[PDB]
Design a protein around this ligand. Structure first.
Ligand SMILES: O=C(COP(=O)(O)O)[C@@H](O)[C@H](O)[C@H](O)COP(=O)(O)O
Ligand SMILES: O=C[C@H](O)COP(=O)(O)O
Ligand code: NA
Ligand code: NA
Ligand SMILES: [Zn+2]
Ligand SMILES: [Zn+2]
Ligand SMILES: [Zn+2]
Ligand SMILES: [Zn+2]
Ligand SMILES: [Zn+2]
Lengths: 292, 293
């Protein structure tokens, strides 16, 4: 059933595993994520960006998720606003029924980030909703993280340790500051969040290229880095790019192999399957499989 | 809001216009259909086939439509089971919250078609749900059979076979519908009538699909003029699916062709929604349901 984000992440924190946080923009993505969680017996963090909310409408984003959680009532599910940019956005998500909200003020100076985060926390906690915030851009200062968490009362923190969003994360070799991560974890003792955590697995890349796609020199976070991140105290692992590439690879394939095909289900059934398999493998990698 | 199918179609029957019945299989199709109805001030008949219901799950099919009707509460909306094949399928749709169900037993002899339809009607009417049935197969409808079939079954609307078929490939040569048979059916039954396989494949939609590398294999729809004549003859519900799929997928193919690095689903499906919406808007104007709210 649909639960506060901290309910899922406190367990992952205490037991030392990672929960993938999977973005969706429509029914097909959402269905595949849920089927993956059902098949791997894994809790689900479902995320919607502000852009996804604009595309679906917040009423449909929440409504579809509520239908899915009634279909799979044994699965712990949190519905999370990804990269909320203003207090008002976070407040709208709370009012609409989200159970976790992220306020991203990491581009502000510490004092302003702390003030805005604290405002969001007060509002969200009054409504029984968990809150994520972000520190670092430059990498996180662990002593700032310690004070920020203590003063804001935020439920989970995304510390900058070297990742970035999209398919092009490393101009060179993948590198994450695990010593910094461990220090943040030691000083905050809360669940931590890894942004930009897609891996671009070799099989997903191969499917995309076989379908005529171009991955312009892309590079994701190696599986070993994700596992080391979880060992270091990461408990929420934001995953979007991997899902899109696997989904769209199959759409492109169907378009290429039959120019007379226009049944939407013939495009999106294989697309769902590929997305589902990415999610299932990620749940096993992160250690959330068989945790229900 | 969400209403019995007959509420929408009795008005169309009495005033002599047609209401498009637009199939959907996911959120993108549904959103575009609703925005079209809002922009043209038109009632909405939303249809889901058994295959679409299996794909979405009946809980999600009904649930998404209820969310959309709350987003646009001034629009009359009926949610209709398209080509239900068994009593049990129709009953499941009634229980899930559909407001209209179609039972297609037209491949049976008259007596068996009438028996099964009557069973569906009794069940659906007891739940406040309207019912469509089909007569004729290909063999065209016998108007005197239509008259007795409607009187005995109490079905709310009838799809009489007058020369259409489903899919993109409708006519081996020139389109042809039996409008005299239609008028006789209408005169004898005096209920709303339904046209199946009513996509037109407009020139611009065909051109968009071909520009995107698609192949329509010499497909031909019902010309706009034949759709208007069918409404003049008494058609009030016009089943439309293929046109929407072609317009939508044309845009998906185009995005895939023009940017090999694009994998944002919204960049594929926003232009696809727009193309589908425009097909629906034009069809609402053609059939005469625009400005009828
Ligand atoms: O970190 C994230 C995903 O990382 P990824 O690119 O999958 O490595 C998410 O929090 C993103 O913020 C999200 O995918 C952005 O979505 P849109 O803003 O494009 O909808
Ligand atoms: O006439 C019925 C529907 O258009 C067929 O749609 P389907 O391909 O989902 O069965
Ligand atoms: Na987030
Ligand atoms: Na029908
Ligand atoms: Zn981020
Ligand atoms: Zn992010
Ligand atoms: Zn971030
Ligand atoms: Zn039919
Ligand atoms: Zn039919």
């Amino acid at each position: 059933m649909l639960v506060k984000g901290n309910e899922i992440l406190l367990k992952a924190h205490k037991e030392g595993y990672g929960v993938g946080a999977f973005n969706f923009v429509n029914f097909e993505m959402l269905n595949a994520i849920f089927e993956a969680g059902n098949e791997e017996n894994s809790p689900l963090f479902i995320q919607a960006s502000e852009g996804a909310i604009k595309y679906m409408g917040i009423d449909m984003a929440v409504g579809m998720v509520k239908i899915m959680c009634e279909r799979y009532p044994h699965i712990p599910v949190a519905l999370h606003l990804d990269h909320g940019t203003t207090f008002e956005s976070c407040e709208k998500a709370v009012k609409a029924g989200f159970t976790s909200v992220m306020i991203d003020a990491s581009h502000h100076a510490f004092e302003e980030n702390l003030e805005l985060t604290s405002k969001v926390v007060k509002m969200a906690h009054n409504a029984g909703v968990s809150v994520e915030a972000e520190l670092g851009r430059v990498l996180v200062n662990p002593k700032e993280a310690e004070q920020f968490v203590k003063e804001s009362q935020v439920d989970y923190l995304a510390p900058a340790i070297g990742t970035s969003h999209g398919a092009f994360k490393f101009k060179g070799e993948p590198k994450l500051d695990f010593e910094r991560l461990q220090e943040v974890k030691r000083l905050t003792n809360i669940p931590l969040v890894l942004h930009g955590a897609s891996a671009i697995p070799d099989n997903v890349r191969k499917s995309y290229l076989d379908a005529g796609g171009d991955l312009k020199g892309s590079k994701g976070v190696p599986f070993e880095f994700l596992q080391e991140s979880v060992k270091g105290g990461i408990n929420k692992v934001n995953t979007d790019t991997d899902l899109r590439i696997a989904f769209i690879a199959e759409v492109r394939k169907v378009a290429n192999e039959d120019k007379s095909q226009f049944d939407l289900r013939k495009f999106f059934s294989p697309a769902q399957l590929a997305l589902k398999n990415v999610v299932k493998e990620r749940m096993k990698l992160l250690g959330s499989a068989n945790k229900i």
